[PDB]
């Protein structure tokens, strides 16, 4: 059930609004992540989606729920007109605001009668005072910037009309921005984050099947060097991995132990955990991105905001505690689209320890959410079925699942597919 992934749970008023104005009885997990971050945290977002299926709900739902205004900035005039028309058909007041609009329509926007207002980036930069007035008198729930990759000079479609959207955060500092694009390029994404002046944005990336990620689950011995030796290559008088690697561990103590063994081999590596000083954490991050260290041995604390496309290997040294956390972690591998591998090395004792630590969570609702995330991970680790099929069924839509049927069953899919093949 994908309702298990919704943290925190949507309330009855939110569900009633979804059914009444959008015709859905439930939120998809990625939509809920964006909607909740906007409503409760006013958080900036970068939502990358391979297709337009379920994209508009992320930015249309929040202003409708709070009865305020959502501004949508896009250069796709005909699509914006179609979306305005579909909103009106659902009894949601919406309009395309341009230089040709009537004074009667602009007066109703100023009075807070329209929930969604679509504008071009050119109209937006020429009428900032209007947006400041709307924020002061009504309140803008969010600003959605569609085709956000157009603000990047290294993208395939740079538009100067988008560069000016860099002033949105200075004109409207409390308004969260939801940048939308179909490109999953991590380098283009860094430029979107910077040029729009987004602060700690939540990043989501959905609709991609990623056949370049090989998945394997293997039993551990707990003898660290014995477990990691198959991944190592003797190079001169020291040892190395095939490429940039992240080893995710369940604890700070395990990161020190694993790094200690790899340091004995003079492997280029560093430790990362939330117990380190700010300067030491910055240096490991800096050295990994500059390729001055090949391998980072880390807790869950490492990973977000790393613009690194050539992570060739992710190793989870110990059973992951949470299926959702595992998904974010392996998603950091092979963002350049080249072959990468994601291996879990685990033992039943790791799961028993993980379960004991779960009893330490004081918030009962959160503890149950975490318990459900752990149960999904345990089932995945013990499974003899396709690993890719399990993961996509938990996190992706039916189209992406359907698209993965081409690699499923083949020698490049996962360890279970290779074992079933021969
Ligand atoms: C897991 C989501 C995801 C990515 N995040 C972004 C957020 N984040 C942050 O660290 C992060 N969060 C918050 C703030 C800042 C941050 O930086 C973690 C990594 C990502 O960076 N990318 N990049 C892509 C590409 C797709 C195709 O072009 C190349 C790049 N896809 C994602 N995804 C989706 C994805 O990987 N799905 C997926 C699909 C199939 C499999 C399977 F079955 F094959 F194994 C496995 C998986 C996981
Ligand atoms: Zn498989």
Author numbering: 523 to 944
Original authors' sentences:
Our medicinal chemistry strategy was to improve permeability and lipE simultaneously, two properties that are typically anticorrelated, by using physics-based property prediction (logP, 3D polar surface area) to systematically search for outlier transformations. Two examples of transformations that lower logP while improving permeability are the introduction of the ortho-methyl aniline in compound 3 and the hydroxy pyrimidine in compound 4, HRO761. Compound 3 showed a dose-dependent exposure in the blood, inducing a stable disease at 150 mg per kg given orally twice daily. Moreover, SW48 tumours treated with analogue 3 showed an enrichment of the p53 pathway in vivo and confirmed the genes identified by RNA-seq.
